[PDB]
Protein backbone atom coordinates (compact mmCIF):
# COMPACT_ATOMS: atom_id res chain seq x y z
CA UNK A 1 0.00 0.00 0.00
CA UNK A 2 0.78 3.72 0.15
CA UNK A 3 -0.57 3.71 3.77
CA UNK A 4 -2.51 6.91 3.14
CA UNK A 5 -5.00 7.82 5.84
CA UNK A 6 -8.61 8.74 4.97
CA UNK A 7 -10.31 11.87 6.28
CA UNK A 8 -12.05 9.72 8.89
CA UNK A 9 -8.73 8.04 9.83
CA UNK A 10 -6.89 11.31 10.21
CA UNK A 11 -9.19 12.32 13.08
CA UNK A 12 -10.28 9.00 14.63
CA UNK A 13 -10.11 8.64 18.38
CA UNK A 14 -9.54 5.57 20.55
CA UNK A 15 -11.98 2.73 21.15
CA UNK A 16 -11.77 2.65 24.92
CA UNK A 17 -11.43 -0.65 26.87
CA UNK A 18 -14.34 -2.41 28.54
CA UNK A 19 -13.17 -2.61 32.16
CA UNK A 20 -16.28 -4.12 33.80
CA UNK A 21 -16.41 -7.87 34.56
CA UNK A 22 -18.31 -8.52 31.30
CA UNK A 23 -17.76 -12.21 30.42
CA UNK A 24 -17.50 -13.65 26.87
CA UNK A 25 -19.20 -16.75 25.41
CA UNK A 26 -16.95 -18.97 16.06
CA UNK A 27 -13.22 -18.32 16.54
CA UNK A 28 -12.43 -21.39 14.45
CA UNK A 29 -11.48 -19.56 11.26
CA UNK A 30 -8.96 -17.48 13.36
CA UNK A 31 -7.31 -19.59 16.06
CA UNK A 32 -7.14 -22.76 13.93
CA UNK A 33 -4.05 -23.99 12.11
CA UNK A 34 -5.00 -24.52 8.40
CA UNK A 35 -2.52 -27.36 8.05
CA UNK A 36 -3.64 -29.73 10.85
CA UNK A 37 -7.03 -27.96 11.05
CA UNK A 38 -6.43 -28.06 14.80
CA UNK A 39 -6.01 -25.11 17.16
CA UNK A 40 -2.69 -23.30 16.79
CA UNK A 41 0.16 -24.44 19.06
CA UNK A 42 3.48 -22.52 19.24
CA UNK A 43 2.17 -20.20 16.57
CA UNK A 44 4.58 -19.30 13.81
CA UNK A 45 3.70 -16.45 11.49
CA UNK A 46 4.94 -15.77 7.96
CA UNK A 47 6.58 -12.35 7.79
CA UNK A 48 5.40 -11.45 4.24
CA UNK A 49 1.78 -12.52 4.52
CA UNK A 50 0.97 -12.84 8.24
CA UNK A 51 -0.36 -16.36 7.97
CA UNK A 52 -0.26 -18.39 11.14
CA UNK A 53 0.56 -22.06 11.58
CA UNK A 54 1.73 -24.35 14.37
CA UNK A 55 5.53 -24.34 14.61
CA UNK A 56 5.68 -28.11 14.01
CA UNK A 57 3.23 -27.90 11.03
CA UNK A 58 4.90 -25.14 9.04
CA UNK A 59 8.44 -26.47 9.76
CA UNK A 60 7.20 -29.85 8.47
CA UNK A 61 5.74 -28.31 5.25
CA UNK A 62 8.96 -26.41 4.53
CA UNK A 63 11.15 -29.47 5.38
CA UNK A 64 9.17 -31.46 2.77
CA UNK A 65 10.71 -29.14 0.19
CA UNK A 66 7.51 -27.20 -0.53
CA UNK A 67 8.63 -23.57 -0.12
CA UNK A 68 5.19 -22.01 -0.46
CA UNK A 69 3.00 -20.54 2.21
CA UNK A 70 0.22 -23.14 2.73
CA UNK A 71 -2.37 -20.36 2.97
CA UNK A 72 -1.46 -18.04 0.10
CA UNK A 73 1.31 -19.75 -1.87
CA UNK A 74 3.78 -16.89 -1.48
CA UNK A 75 7.45 -17.85 -1.68
CA UNK A 76 9.06 -18.82 1.63
CA UNK A 77 12.84 -19.16 1.47
CA UNK A 78 13.28 -20.78 4.92
CA UNK A 79 12.17 -20.63 8.59
CA UNK A 80 13.81 -17.20 8.75
CA UNK A 81 10.74 -16.15 6.71
CA UNK A 82 8.81 -16.93 9.90
CA UNK A 83 8.51 -15.34 13.34
CA UNK A 84 7.24 -16.88 16.60
CA UNK A 85 3.99 -15.34 17.70
CA UNK A 86 4.01 -15.61 21.53
CA UNK A 87 1.38 -13.01 21.75
CA UNK A 88 -1.02 -15.16 19.66
CA UNK A 89 -0.25 -18.18 21.79
CA UNK A 90 -0.98 -16.09 24.92
CA UNK A 91 -4.39 -15.07 23.62
CA UNK A 92 -5.12 -18.74 22.84
CA UNK A 93 -4.02 -19.74 26.35
CA UNK A 94 -6.58 -17.50 28.02
CA UNK A 95 -9.49 -18.25 25.63
CA UNK A 96 -8.92 -22.03 25.69
Amino acid sequence: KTWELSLYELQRTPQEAITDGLEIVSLHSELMCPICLDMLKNTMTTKECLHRFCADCIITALRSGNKECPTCRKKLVSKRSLRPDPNFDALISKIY
Partner: protein
Protein backbone atom coordinates in the same frame (compact mmCIF):
# COMPACT_ATOMS: atom_id res chain seq x y z
CA UNK B 1 -16.80 -18.03 29.24
CA UNK B 2 -13.91 -15.56 29.89
CA UNK B 3 -13.53 -12.12 31.52
CA UNK B 4 -12.91 -9.45 28.82
CA UNK B 5 -10.40 -7.75 31.19
CA UNK B 6 -8.38 -10.98 30.94
CA UNK B 7 -8.36 -10.61 27.14
CA UNK B 8 -7.80 -6.84 26.88
CA UNK B 9 -4.03 -6.93 27.05
CA UNK B 10 -3.99 -8.96 23.83
CA UNK B 11 -6.53 -6.75 22.00
CA UNK B 12 -5.23 -3.30 22.78
CA UNK B 13 -2.99 -0.83 21.04
CA UNK B 14 -0.30 0.77 23.22
CA UNK B 15 -0.15 3.93 21.09
CA UNK B 16 -3.78 4.97 21.76
CA UNK B 17 -4.63 2.83 24.82
CA UNK B 18 -7.75 1.44 23.09
CA UNK B 19 -8.80 -1.65 21.14
CA UNK B 20 -7.10 -2.40 17.79
CA UNK B 21 -8.93 -0.76 14.87
CA UNK B 22 -7.48 -1.94 11.53
CA UNK B 23 -4.82 -3.95 13.38
CA UNK B 24 -1.46 -3.59 11.67
CA UNK B 25 1.58 -5.64 12.52
CA UNK B 26 5.37 -4.99 12.31
CA UNK B 27 6.77 -8.05 10.55
CA UNK B 28 10.19 -7.98 12.29
CA UNK B 29 8.84 -8.54 15.84
CA UNK B 30 5.14 -9.12 15.35
CA UNK B 31 3.94 -6.27 17.61
CA UNK B 32 0.54 -4.91 16.50
CA UNK B 33 -1.09 -1.49 16.61
CA UNK B 34 -4.07 0.34 15.06
CA UNK B 35 -3.31 1.26 11.50
CA UNK B 36 -3.62 5.04 12.11
CA UNK B 37 -1.50 4.89 15.29
CA UNK B 38 1.45 3.03 13.80
CA UNK B 39 1.45 4.90 10.47
CA UNK B 40 1.63 8.27 12.24
CA UNK B 41 4.24 6.95 14.70
CA UNK B 42 6.49 5.64 11.94
CA UNK B 43 6.58 9.17 10.44
CA UNK B 44 9.16 9.91 13.14
CA UNK B 45 10.67 6.58 14.17
CA UNK B 46 11.95 3.42 12.49
CA UNK B 47 11.85 1.39 15.72
CA UNK B 48 9.03 -0.63 17.22
CA UNK B 49 7.15 1.41 19.92
CA UNK B 50 7.13 -1.62 22.23
CA UNK B 51 10.42 -3.52 21.78
CA UNK B 52 12.62 -0.94 19.96
CA UNK B 53 13.61 -3.38 17.22
CA UNK B 54 14.41 -1.69 13.84
CA UNK B 55 11.30 -1.99 11.63
CA UNK B 56 13.24 -1.24 8.43
CA UNK B 57 16.62 0.24 7.54
CA UNK B 58 15.07 3.35 5.94
CA UNK B 59 11.40 2.88 4.98
CA UNK B 60 9.53 1.31 7.93
CA UNK B 61 6.19 1.20 6.03
CA UNK B 62 7.72 -1.53 3.84
CA UNK B 63 7.76 -3.77 6.88
CA UNK B 64 4.21 -3.46 8.27
CA UNK B 65 1.21 -5.51 7.13
CA UNK B 66 -2.52 -5.27 7.76
CA UNK B 67 -3.34 -8.06 10.18
CA UNK B 68 -6.80 -9.15 9.13
CA UNK B 69 -6.82 -12.26 11.35
CA UNK B 70 -6.00 -10.26 14.48
CA UNK B 71 -8.56 -7.57 13.68
CA UNK B 72 -11.22 -10.26 12.94
CA UNK B 73 -10.57 -11.74 16.45
CA UNK B 74 -10.80 -8.31 18.01
CA UNK B 75 -14.15 -7.53 16.41
CA UNK B 76 -15.55 -10.99 17.17
CA UNK B 77 -14.50 -10.91 20.86
CA UNK B 78 -15.19 -7.33 21.97
CA UNK B 79 -18.97 -6.85 22.40
CA UNK B 80 -20.19 -3.74 20.57
CA UNK B 81 -16.82 -2.70 19.18
CA UNK B 82 -17.48 -3.31 15.45
CA UNK B 83 -20.95 -1.74 15.53
CA UNK B 84 -19.50 1.20 17.40
CA UNK B 85 -16.63 1.79 14.96
CA UNK B 86 -18.94 1.39 11.92
CA UNK B 87 -21.32 4.00 13.45
CA UNK B 88 -18.48 6.47 14.13
CA UNK B 89 -17.50 6.22 10.48
CA UNK B 90 -21.07 6.87 9.24
CA UNK B 91 -21.53 9.69 11.69
CA UNK B 92 -18.25 11.28 10.53
CA UNK B 93 -19.16 11.11 6.89
CA UNK B 94 -22.71 12.44 7.37
CA UNK B 95 -21.30 15.59 8.95
CA UNK B 96 -18.39 15.69 6.41
CA UNK B 97 -19.82 15.12 2.88
CA UNK B 98 -17.77 14.58 -0.31
Amino acid sequence: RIKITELNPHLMCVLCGGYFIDATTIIECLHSFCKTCIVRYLETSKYCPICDVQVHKTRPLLNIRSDKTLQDIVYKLVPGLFKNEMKRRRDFYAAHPS
